RNA sequence: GAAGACAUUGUCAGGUGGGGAGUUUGGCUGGGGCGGCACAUCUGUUAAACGAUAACGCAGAUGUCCUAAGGGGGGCUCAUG
RNA sequence: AAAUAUGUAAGAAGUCCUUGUUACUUAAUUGAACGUGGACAUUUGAAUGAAGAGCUUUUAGUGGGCCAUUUUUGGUAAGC
RNA sequence: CACGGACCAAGGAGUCUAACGUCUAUGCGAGUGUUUGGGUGUAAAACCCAUACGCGUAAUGAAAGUGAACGUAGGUUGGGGCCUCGCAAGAGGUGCACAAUCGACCGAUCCUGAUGUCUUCGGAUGGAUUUGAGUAAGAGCAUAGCUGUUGGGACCCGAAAG
RNA sequence: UUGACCUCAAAUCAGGUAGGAGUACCCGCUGAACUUAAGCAUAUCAAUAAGCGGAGGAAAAGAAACCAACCGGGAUUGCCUUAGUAACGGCGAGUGAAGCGGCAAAAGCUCAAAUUUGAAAUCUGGUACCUUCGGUGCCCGAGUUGUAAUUUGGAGAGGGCAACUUUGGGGCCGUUCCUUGUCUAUGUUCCUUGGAACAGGACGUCAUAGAGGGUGAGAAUCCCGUGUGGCGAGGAGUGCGGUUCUUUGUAAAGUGCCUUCGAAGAGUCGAGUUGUUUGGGAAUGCAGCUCUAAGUGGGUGGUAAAUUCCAUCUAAAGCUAA
């Protein structure tokens, strides 16, 4: 998918657009990441601050599955209900008929409070939650049933 | 070699990689060979359905334990409860695994029921003959799927008691954190003359 | 170990009706016998002690068991192996050498 | 015959080891080498009355010293004749 | 103590009058800062111009320089 | 009075890849990506597809860990466009995007440290010349293209060496 | 003196086997430097090239001394991903896996350690015969310094009680596979050009066949073929289906309850040191030397150590397709 390349246009011109003085050479400043502390330093500082050095603790044999904890916000919480039942449950805003939501089956670990669900009772089954999420749910009329 | 604002790339090509490039032009051909092998196997073998009946199994870690999965085999206990022996099961199309154990009655009963369904829905040819033709199926897995068990219904009442789930979690965490200190403190306080 | 039903704490996870599987016959591997006891007793009788075991019974008679465990940890590898070897030596000493 | 639990052999450890191996052996520079540092800094001047401004330009300095030679207050007024 | 060169300003984000907020400030509802409300407009606050003004992204080549007038250092001087 | 070039023919030099950036086009859009694989086939094409997985939708902190609405999702200044009056010029209202600014929210840091208490735990509430690659009604995913980047024989030829 | 045993020899003893080639792919050993780091020694190149030994149609690996920390999975291999990640690193250049998950493909087992002891029940060889890729008899021998049956950890064995179930080898014929032969449609009609019609034009035919090639120029219809079906031949194999002859069997296997037992691999594991290697970090693996275990033990649980617990496997012997 090539022939709209500038080589096709530089045909005829001597240097192929790399210059007569500089004279395109092989690796005139180094290979790869050479000189990060010596002659490419002003690039690394300013555009890569933090590149050199260690910081924190090591973890030998980290498994990310231990740290699987994907988050759901309350604004997106009502999407775990299918659209078929959603208006039914938006109406009949009641105890004794309140929808159950398994956020873990949806694929979520922690619930978080980014804002303003409607004043409808909801049962939210979650591994973890936050303070505001629990407050907002309990204020809308629901509860959080912890699970594992 | 370092230039304008761009990410640091880590491209691992400082070896003779061109000698070990593999391009899968053989993809569609290997597919064809694989289909032909399945077909040849079905025909050559039998009216037998190309695969053993595998069990339902609860997956490992917190990431995946919510799912339920197809395992390898049927835990000699489960087989004995289904009412047959391991050797006959292996002859009859059941995968057996000696090196796993039942700790959960739900999975145990699910797999036993699965075995009973299989034992009812098969017909086993005699040792002698007369070969009543049976018009085979190719997938025990497709005849016997892997269903996710549900926990609770959509709708329930609200059972609140003001326990503050967040506080609950924090107190569990604190209890685990400060268990050993307390179990040393009480121990060294019991040393009262 | 009954679980709690939550995702953190001392006991942690799903409440599940347990089933307590049968005890495998492995997990009972080094749980010796009558025969092995007999054979090992008789072979100890025949062969006897080795040089560092002589050193250890001497060090237990003279310089106590702390230095004995030290010596046995240098001679063997582990502190637990040293412990068990010193106890073997004490069962040798206190049982036969008294009467 | 001699010798003898020593030598030898094996593994560690120390010393020696250009015999040999591998590598390195600065820059500025009225060519380079010798010389010097103009290679990190300060004052005056060059420097052309904002600022900036070179030369192995001029005249010099720095890698320290101080529990006071820092801080505050009070009183006094110095060199010289 | 020049000449040349150099900074700022030449107003609507402005000026004036009334009066609100504050944990700052004051001896003090005195100030400071920010405001409400009101008044002053088409010479709305020198000139000339404005082939548009403002803003962002990315990337090439270059990073040996040389000459002339004038100012000037070293040098006897030099196409130094 | 620097280098190559006696002449002619043919050959002859910024390519392909992996991962990427900005920009442009297209498709869907709080999602997106069928093509590892399966089914199917007028067969290495085209057609269909499950579960996963990747990126994205949540930052922050060394980590433990906590985790984004006082308020019509804030105020002020300006803002295209729209609306009302006006013959028009103008006036007033509303004001997306964007910009400047003052605030609020989440996280780290430093303080305060309540009701309660396995009496060493817990952490409210209120703050700060501190800090974040943040929130403050989502924009991304995939494919393709120019250009540019890195590694690769890496535009072509070229050492003394090892 | 005679005859044995043990160890060691020789024979052109009877019968066999190894060597070398090939070496794309595979199992190992050994092992660089160029190069990158804008210099260069660690590093990198690379656990690569070169060198050596060894195999097959695949090899290797392989049915846990595993992964984990789950509501727990469950031989091995490979793909997608994990992941340019955790980690290593003059923490510089650079390097850099694994568990989970989805898929392909799936397959499981064998020994040693047990007195058969009321009967070495086992096996090579030679010879005679035979329905001879083997069988029966007879005779020497090997072998109890342990050949068969039985058992391998998932279990299992010895006794006792109770009953119930299920069985093996051939011959033939079809089928499967492989190889191969053969048969199976239509214009060479007319005119022009041309040396030649396979061109052009007119009329037509076949088509589950207009793919290709050849023939004096671009031919479905001239030839071979192609397409579709049919008829045959010869081998491998019992992988399957119909047949026929032998019932081997007071044999073997499976299942329930009570009781007594339950052997499980050492110069090894492990440790210290050295060197090499690894992402492997107070030491990932390997090897050398030194030390050297145990049995309610041992290993592993990615920060050295002691104490207490827990979880999970069961090494130091072995086979096996895709």
Swiss-Prot record, chain A:
<dbReference type="GO" id="GO:0005737">
    <property type="term" value="C:cytoplasm"/>
</dbReference>
<comment type="similarity">
    <text>Belongs to the universal ribosomal protein uL15 family.</text>
</comment>
<dbReference type="GO" id="GO:0003723">
    <property type="term" value="F:RNA binding"/>
</dbReference>
<dbReference type="InterPro" id="IPR030878">
    <property type="entry name" value="Ribosomal_uL15"/>
</dbReference>
<dbReference type="Pfam" id="PF00828">
    <property type="entry name" value="Ribosomal_L27A"/>
</dbReference>
<feature type="compositionally biased region" description="Basic residues">
    <location>
        <begin position="20"/>
        <end position="29"/>
    </location>
</feature>
<dbReference type="GO" id="GO:0005634">
    <property type="term" value="C:nucleus"/>
</dbReference>
<protein>
    <recommendedName>
        <fullName>Large ribosomal subunit protein uL15</fullName>
    </recommendedName>
</protein>
<dbReference type="InterPro" id="IPR036227">
    <property type="entry name" value="Ribosomal_uL15/eL18_sf"/>
</dbReference>
<keyword id="KW-1017">Isopeptide bond</keyword>
<keyword id="KW-0832">Ubl conjugation</keyword>
<feature type="compositionally biased region" description="Basic residues">
    <location>
        <begin position="1"/>
        <end position="13"/>
    </location>
</feature>
<comment type="subunit">
    <text>Component of the large ribosomal subunit (LSU). Mature yeast ribosomes consist of a small (40S) and a large (60S) subunit. The 40S small subunit contains 1 molecule of ribosomal RNA (18S rRNA) and 33 different proteins (encoded by 57 genes). The large 60S subunit contains 3 rRNA molecules (25S, 5.8S and 5S rRNA) and 46 different proteins (encoded by 81 genes).</text>
</comment>
<keyword id="KW-0687">Ribonucleoprotein</keyword>
<feature type="short sequence motif" description="Nuclear localization signal">
    <location>
        <begin position="6"/>
        <end position="12"/>
    </location>
</feature>
From Swiss-Prot, chain B:
<dbReference type="InterPro" id="IPR001380">
    <property type="entry name" value="Ribosomal_eL13"/>
</dbReference>
<dbReference type="Pfam" id="PF01294">
    <property type="entry name" value="Ribosomal_L13e"/>
</dbReference>
<comment type="similarity">
    <text>Belongs to the eukaryotic ribosomal protein eL13 family.</text>
</comment>
<comment type="function">
    <text>Component of the ribosome, a large ribonucleoprotein complex responsible for the synthesis of proteins in the cell. The small ribosomal subunit (SSU) binds messenger RNAs (mRNAs) and translates the encoded message by selecting cognate aminoacyl-transfer RNA (tRNA) molecules. The large subunit (LSU) contains the ribosomal catalytic site termed the peptidyl transferase center (PTC), which catalyzes the formation of peptide bonds, thereby polymerizing the amino acids delivered by tRNAs into a polypeptide chain.</text>
</comment>
<keyword id="KW-0689">Ribosomal protein</keyword>
<protein>
    <recommendedName>
        <fullName>Large ribosomal subunit protein eL13A</fullName>
    </recommendedName>
</protein>
<comment type="subunit">
    <text>Component of the large ribosomal subunit (LSU). Mature yeast ribosomes consist of a small (40S) and a large (60S) subunit. The 40S small subunit contains 1 molecule of ribosomal RNA (18S rRNA) and 33 different proteins (encoded by 57 genes). The large 60S subunit contains 3 rRNA molecules (25S, 5.8S and 5S rRNA) and 46 different proteins (encoded by 81 genes).</text>
</comment>
<keyword id="KW-0687">Ribonucleoprotein</keyword>
<dbReference type="GO" id="GO:0002181">
    <property type="term" value="P:cytoplasmic translation"/>
</dbReference>
<dbReference type="GO" id="GO:0005829">
    <property type="term" value="C:cytosol"/>
</dbReference>
<keyword id="KW-0963">Cytoplasm</keyword>
<dbReference type="InterPro" id="IPR018256">
    <property type="entry name" value="Ribosomal_eL13_CS"/>
</dbReference>
<keyword id="KW-0597">Phosphoprotein</keyword>
<dbReference type="GO" id="GO:0022625">
    <property type="term" value="C:cytosolic large ribosomal subunit"/>
</dbReference>
<feature type="modified residue" description="Phosphothreonine">
    <location>
        <position position="151"/>
    </location>
</feature>
From Swiss-Prot, chain C:
<protein>
    <recommendedName>
        <fullName>Large ribosomal subunit protein eL36A</fullName>
    </recommendedName>
</protein>
<dbReference type="GO" id="GO:0002181">
    <property type="term" value="P:cytoplasmic translation"/>
</dbReference>
<keyword id="KW-0687">Ribonucleoprotein</keyword>
<keyword id="KW-0689">Ribosomal protein</keyword>
<dbReference type="InterPro" id="IPR000509">
    <property type="entry name" value="Ribosomal_eL36"/>
</dbReference>
<keyword id="KW-0963">Cytoplasm</keyword>
<dbReference type="GO" id="GO:0005829">
    <property type="term" value="C:cytosol"/>
</dbReference>
<comment type="subunit">
    <text>Component of the large ribosomal subunit (LSU). Mature yeast ribosomes consist of a small (40S) and a large (60S) subunit. The 40S small subunit contains 1 molecule of ribosomal RNA (18S rRNA) and 33 different proteins (encoded by 57 genes). The large 60S subunit contains 3 rRNA molecules (25S, 5.8S and 5S rRNA) and 46 different proteins (encoded by 81 genes).</text>
</comment>
<dbReference type="GO" id="GO:0022625">
    <property type="term" value="C:cytosolic large ribosomal subunit"/>
</dbReference>
<dbReference type="GO" id="GO:0003723">
    <property type="term" value="F:RNA binding"/>
</dbReference>
<dbReference type="Pfam" id="PF01158">
    <property type="entry name" value="Ribosomal_L36e"/>
</dbReference>
<dbReference type="GO" id="GO:0003735">
    <property type="term" value="F:structural constituent of ribosome"/>
</dbReference>
<comment type="similarity">
    <text>Belongs to the eukaryotic ribosomal protein eL36 family.</text>
</comment>
<dbReference type="InterPro" id="IPR038097">
    <property type="entry name" value="Ribosomal_eL36_sf"/>
</dbReference>
<keyword id="KW-0007">Acetylation</keyword>
């Amino acid at each position: 998918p090539s022939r709209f390349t500038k080589t096709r246009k530089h045909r005829g011109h001597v240097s192929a657009g790399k210059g007569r003085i500089g004279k395109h050479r092989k690796h005139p400043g180094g290979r790869g990441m050479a000189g990060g502390q010596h002659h490419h330093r002003i690039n690394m500082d300013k555009y890569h601050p933090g590149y050199f050095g260690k910081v924190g603790m090591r973890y030998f044999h980290k498994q990310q599955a231990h740290f699987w904890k994907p988050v759901l916000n309350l604004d997106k919480l009502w999407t775990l209900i299918p659209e078929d039942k959603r208006d039914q449950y938006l109406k009949s805003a009641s105890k004794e008929t309140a929808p159950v939501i398994d956020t873990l089956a949806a694929g979520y670990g922690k619930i978080l409070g980014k804002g303003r669900i409607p004043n409808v009772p909801v049962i939210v089954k979650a591994r973890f939650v936050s303070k505001l999420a629990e407050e907002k749910i309990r204020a809308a009329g629901g509860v959080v049933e912890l699970i594992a | 070699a370092i230039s304008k604002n761009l990410p640091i790339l880590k491209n691992h090509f400082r070896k003779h990689w061109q000698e070990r490039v593999k391009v899968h032009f053989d993809q569609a051909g290997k597919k064809v060979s694989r289909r032909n092998a399945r077909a040849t196997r079905a025909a050559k073998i039998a009216p037998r359905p190309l695969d053993l009946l595998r069990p339902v199994v609860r997956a490992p870690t917190v990431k995946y334990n919510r799912k339920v999965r197809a395992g390898r085999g049927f835990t000699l206990a489960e087989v004995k409860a289904a009412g047959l022996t391991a050797a006959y099961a292996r002859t009859i199309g059941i995968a057996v695994d000696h090196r796993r154990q039942n700790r959960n009655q739900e999975i145990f009963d699910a797999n036993v029921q699965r075995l009973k369904e299989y034992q009812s829905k098969i017909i086993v040819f005699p040792r002698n003959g007369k070969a009543p033709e049976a018009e085979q199926v190719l997938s025990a897995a497709a005849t016997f799927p892997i269903a996710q068990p549900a926990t609770d219904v959509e709708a329930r009442a609200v059972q609140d008691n003001g326990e503050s789930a967040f506080r609950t979690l924090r107190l569990a965490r604190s209890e685990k954190k400060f268990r050993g200190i307390r179990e040393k403190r009480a121990r060294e306080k019991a040393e009262a003359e | 170990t009954v679980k709690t039903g939550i995702a953190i704490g001392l006991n942690k996870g799903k409440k599940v009706t347990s089933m307590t599987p049968a005890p495998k016959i492995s997990y009972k591997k080094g749980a010796a016998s009558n025969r092995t006891k007999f054979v090992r007793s008789l072979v100890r009788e025949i062969a006897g002690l080795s040089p560092y075991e002589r050193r250890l019974i001497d060090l237990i008679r003279n310089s106590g068991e702390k230095r004995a465990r030290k010596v046995a940890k240098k001679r063997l590898g582990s502190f637990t192996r040293a412990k068990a070897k010193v106890e073997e030596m004490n069962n040798i000493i206190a049982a036969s050498r008294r009467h």
